[PDB]
């Protein structure tokens, strides 16, 4: 199931769709790839075959 | 079980009741936690739940 999401994930009982600075957090983050990270942050050429 | 050991563990034939250094070591060794180390040498804080 390929899924796409943009809306802000909520962590409380209140409604939350686009409010920031509250317990709601963004469900995505951007990768940082540099040679200073050995194994923890390194890109890989992984391809799954079914 | 919970063990609190302060005496010297013996690893030879002479009784290491209070003498260490020649054939016996202190059983407690502190962790080496450096921020300049790799990802696999970082202090992870872990809790149990049974």
Swiss-Prot record, chains A, B:
Descriptive protein name: Spike protein S1
Source species, domain of life: Viruses
Quaternary structure and interacting proteins, as annotated: Binds to host ACE2. RBD also interacts with the N-linked glycan on 'Asn-90' of ACE2. Cleavage of S generates a polybasic C-terminal sequence on S1 that binds to host Neuropilin-1 (NRP1) and Neuropilin-2 (NRP2) receptors. Interacts with host integrin alpha-5/beta-1 (ITGA5:ITGB1) and with ACE2 in complex with integrin alpha-5/beta-1 (ITGA5:ITGB1). May interact via cytoplasmic c-terminus with M protein. May interact (via N-terminus) with host bilirubin and biliverdin, thereby preventing antibody binding to the SARS-CoV-2 spike NTD via an allosteric mechanism.
Recorded consequence of changing residue 32 to S: In strain: Omicron/BA.1
Effect of residue 29 to Y: Reduced host ACE2-binding affinity in vitro
Ranges where the record places region Disordered: 1-26
Span covered, complete protein: 465 to 514 of 1273
Protein task: Attaches the virion to the cell membrane by interacting with host receptor, initiating the infection. The major receptor is host ACE2. When S2/S2' has been cleaved, binding to the receptor triggers direct fusion at the cell membrane. When S2/S2' has not been cleaved, binding to the receptor results in internalization of the virus by endocytosis using host TFRC and GRM2 and leading to fusion of the virion membrane with the host endosomal membrane. Alternatively, may use NRP1/NRP2 and integrin as entry receptors.
Covalent S-S links between cysteines: 16-24
Region (Receptor-binding motif): 1-44
């Amino acid at each position: 199931e390929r899924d796409i999401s943009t809306e802000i994930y909520q962590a409380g009982n209140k409604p939350c769709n686009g409010v920031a600075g509250v317990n709601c957090y963004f469900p995505l983050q951007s990768y940082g790839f540099r040679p200073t990270y050995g194994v923890g942050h390194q890109p890989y050429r992984v391809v799954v075959l079914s």
